[PDB]
Design a binder for this molecule. Structure first.
Ligand SMILES: O=C(O)[C@@H]1CCCN1S(=O)(=O)c1cccc2c1NSN2
Length: 167
């Protein structure tokens, strides 16, 4: 039993809700919140920009030190950093950004990072300003993640389409 509330159950391990991931995180304080990161951990917009704003830019400060030490992530890769005031940890995951021409096949690799964590609060990878088809992102999530994932979808309209079209 966990404190995630109001989620629809899609499969044995995947749950979904219309919610602002920032407000979900502040309420639940999950062990892991997933960020929709880019390889430079530049948290400018979309989920990343919102999550960082909620940390008063502390996420960006920590991220800049990470990059200065380690260099950029790989597309499809991840790193674990602090969750600041939102969660114990933040798993920064880089899905392919279609608007940069990146290989959508890398979306499966991106979701594989979730399997290193027993429970996560997450957005759909490569959705929103990353330009991928969210119905496809949900499908890849369900077919790749085996650990317990709680998906927050910001747009109420989009949520209804994902539920109604879920096979
Ligand atoms: O729901 C949305 O408006 C957009 C468009 C498609 C998916 N999302 S999102 O970019 O992942 C996103 C951005 C900021 C906050 C949250 C989400 N999801 S949940 N909270």
């Amino acid at each position: 039993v966990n404190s995630f509330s109001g989620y629809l159950k899609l499969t044995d391990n995947v749950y979904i809700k219309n919610a602002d991931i920032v407000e979900e995180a502040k309420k639940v304080k999950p062990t892991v919140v997933v960020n929709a990161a880019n390889v430079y951990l530049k948290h400018g917009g979309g989920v990343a920009g919102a999550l960082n704003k909620a940390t008063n830019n502390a996420m960006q400060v920590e991220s800049d030190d990470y990059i200065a030490t380690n260099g950029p992530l790989k597309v499809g890769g991840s790193c674990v950093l602090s969750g600041h005031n939102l969660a114990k940890h933040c798993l920064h995951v880089v899905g392919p950004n279609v608007n940069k021409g990146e290989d959508i096949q890398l979306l499966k690799s991106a979701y594989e990072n979730f399997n290193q964590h027993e429970v996560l609060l997450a957005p759909l990878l490569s959705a929103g300003i990353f330009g991928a088809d969210p119905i496809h992102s949900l499908r890849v999530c369900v077919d790749t993640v085996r650990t317990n994932v709680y998906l927050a979808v910001f747009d109420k309209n989009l949520y209804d389409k994902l539920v109604s079209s879920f096979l």
